Symmetry: C2
Subunit: 314 residues, 2 copies
Amino acid sequence: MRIPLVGKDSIESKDIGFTLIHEHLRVFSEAVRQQWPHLYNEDEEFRNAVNEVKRAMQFGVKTIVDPTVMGCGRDIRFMEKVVKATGINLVAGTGIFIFIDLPFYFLNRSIDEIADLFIHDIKEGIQGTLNKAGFVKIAADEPGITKDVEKVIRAAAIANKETKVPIITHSNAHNNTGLEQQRILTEEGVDPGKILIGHLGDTDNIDYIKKIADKGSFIGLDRYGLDLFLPVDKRNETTLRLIKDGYSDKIMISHDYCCTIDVGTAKPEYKPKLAPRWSTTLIFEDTIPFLKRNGVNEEVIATIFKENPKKFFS
Amino acid sequence: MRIPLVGKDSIESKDIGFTLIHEHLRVFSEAVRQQWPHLYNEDEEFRNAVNEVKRAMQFGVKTIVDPTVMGCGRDIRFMEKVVKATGINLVAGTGIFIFIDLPFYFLNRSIDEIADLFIHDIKEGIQGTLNKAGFVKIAADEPGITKDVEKVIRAAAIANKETKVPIITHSNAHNNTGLEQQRILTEEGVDPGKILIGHLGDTDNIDYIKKIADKGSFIGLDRYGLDLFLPVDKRNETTLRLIKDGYSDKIMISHDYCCTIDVGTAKPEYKPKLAPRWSTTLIFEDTIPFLKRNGVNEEVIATIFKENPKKFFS
Ligand SMILES: [Co+2]
Ligand SMILES: [Co+2]
Ligand SMILES: [Fe+3]
Ligand SMILES: [Fe+3]
């Protein structure tokens, strides 16, 4: 019994089953929600997330990994409410989601102070609860590896060395931050097989994607349906190409869907053009039927959505 | 009764009395307190706040203006507990305190949606209470007038137009950021006499200070006791030189004291050499006696601590 579950007992990795490795029940800015509660609706958010999870379960999904952490509104109590309503296996995480600078709390604070916050969440529990974190989540985007972004990466390595949970990342697919996160994490002694470099499905540069996978880490083909980053047809033929070239040992697939997100870019006005078919079940409606009538047999699908998450968490 | 107060009925500006224009009951990072509650202690914070305010009332302070807003952990229920335990007149505000970028919630959101939040706090109330904001707080520091900093400035100008509350600023004394804020706000139509340009007391360069005051705005000599910005001795010389030259009608004086502050810079082991005598009552022991034994009579003292707060809030 290694992997902690929100609102359930920890399970052994052989029981994870068909997993969606990267999906968000709810996303918000902590400071904004605290200071202006009138902009949010708890009841509409709960019922949206319940409705999305149940439909993914009708397609056979057993476990959702939810990498919502500090900076994006991680609420451990909301999550265990959604678990009770649906019965999904739900893995929560710890970490810090920043692109530039840490919050003011962290001025004059060591990398060890930050890693201790991740270890508290893993070993004791999240937000005063006994639900424990099952991975660490870190991020870098267009601003590159800044000094505080580097501090967070090095803090994740300390927490993994001490607890053995794996690491999921957010990177920008067109600026090498994915390769850099992998380089810093492995220089500091993390097993590359415990790193999922994220948002690599945002590019059709097969060479860049393959260079990360050849250094031993999982590649996140994890934003199916966010057309503004890359359209579905283009992601599909990249997934096909990687599978034909033999890379199914490192492929993980998901949607990065947010059953609610408070960001202004994700208004319903903009949905028709930026992300029309985006949801937690799009891969069942499109990608997997696309792969199979393109010669990919069901043993490969099992590897990607079951065997690979099992190894990540083993 | 144009000034609203926390936990009390509003008062006419002529009844504000002896005022400390810039002090903080509590400062923390919204995301950190939300994600790691084990780092904070609500009972100790409450007690530290009650004791400092009681001490300021001992010396005759009637009114405290607390410019804690989003980004610095404003909590109106906490402020109203302190009020009921002490009897102080406490003015809370609205605003956004950032140095670089806004939280992700604001991406693809206009200046008008930002002004709308300030106005909600002024006209309807704060955090779901009927305590209303009496001014708008904005900040800029070392990174200068960035894109998102400029947005918040203009948003504060629009809230001023609709509601007439004044504007307090945080600036860096060696950046010209204080001069930029005054230029931008006055270009969008704000009465220069409703603007307090903050943290000018951190410098001894009197030509820059007189520059902002000459163009009609109050000047904040508001960090008495934070020696790392400037020792008390130099602050007294600058304050006297300004009064001796007729700028008493523009001077406001305070400490920027934080009864509790969570940033690592302010941890207690740093206090002996960063801010030894920092408190809400340092000016009663040092600064006010200094001024009186150098030719400043009680009418000028009353101008700075009673007449100027009154005119600012009129
Ligand atoms: Co991401
Ligand atoms: Co300030
Ligand atoms: Fe995500
Ligand atoms: Fe302040």
